[PDB]
Amino acid sequence: GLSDGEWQQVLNVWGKVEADIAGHGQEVLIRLFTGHPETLEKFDKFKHLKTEAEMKASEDLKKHGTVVLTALGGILKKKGHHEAELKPLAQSHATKHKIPIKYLEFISDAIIHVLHSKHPGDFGADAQGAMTKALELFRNDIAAKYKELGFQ
Ligand code: HEM
């Protein structure tokens, strides 16, 4: 649950992402894959990537980064009223991709890391607080659907 002022911070930060969605999406996935190499094994189309240089050179990884952040941005713009947008993603990630909630924690922290890396000194403590709360809400509502499905 976020206040109006917190949502305003989230959507202000998101403007930074929308200026370069592919570059942000690429770096988020690279941070996930290099920090948590077990996550790469869930992607049949990226498991061939052995080095970060190959990851950086992969145009399909940048494409998928655009898909991921476009979906997340659509959810964030609903300011919590995201049941219709979130349900299909919860279902596909639990039942088809088999993504444990832990990996959603990993990618949430990766987003925070990338924002500081690309905007050092321009991602203030209030903005980090609000973005963190928004990603916690996203993860918590996914977790509720995971529990319904019995997925661990
Ligand atoms: C912010 C969190 C995430 C968002 C918004 C997101 C979004 C998406 C979307 C929109 C798709 C394509 C449609 C679909 O299959 O539902 C997708 C596919 C997929 N996601 Fe995610 N995802 C997220 C996190 C993760 C994480 C953490 C993992 C694994 C560590 C993951 C694994 C996958 C896989 C394996 C696919 C299929 C890729 C393919 O072969 O095309 N997702 N995701």
In angstroms, the first-to-last Cα distance of the chain is 25
Distance between CA atoms of 86 and 53, rounded to whole angstroms? 33
CA 89 to CA 128: how far, in whole Å?
Answer: 24
55 Cβ below 6 A of ligand 1? no
Domain extent listing, the chain: 1-152
Resolution of this entry in Å? 1.4
Tell me, which fold does domain 1-152 have in CATH?
Globin-like (1.10.490)
Question: Going by CA atoms, what residue is nearest to atom 25 of ligand 1?
Answer: 104
For a ligand 1 pocket test, name from 89, 91, 98 the mutation site with the most ligand atoms within 8 angstroms of its C-beta: 89
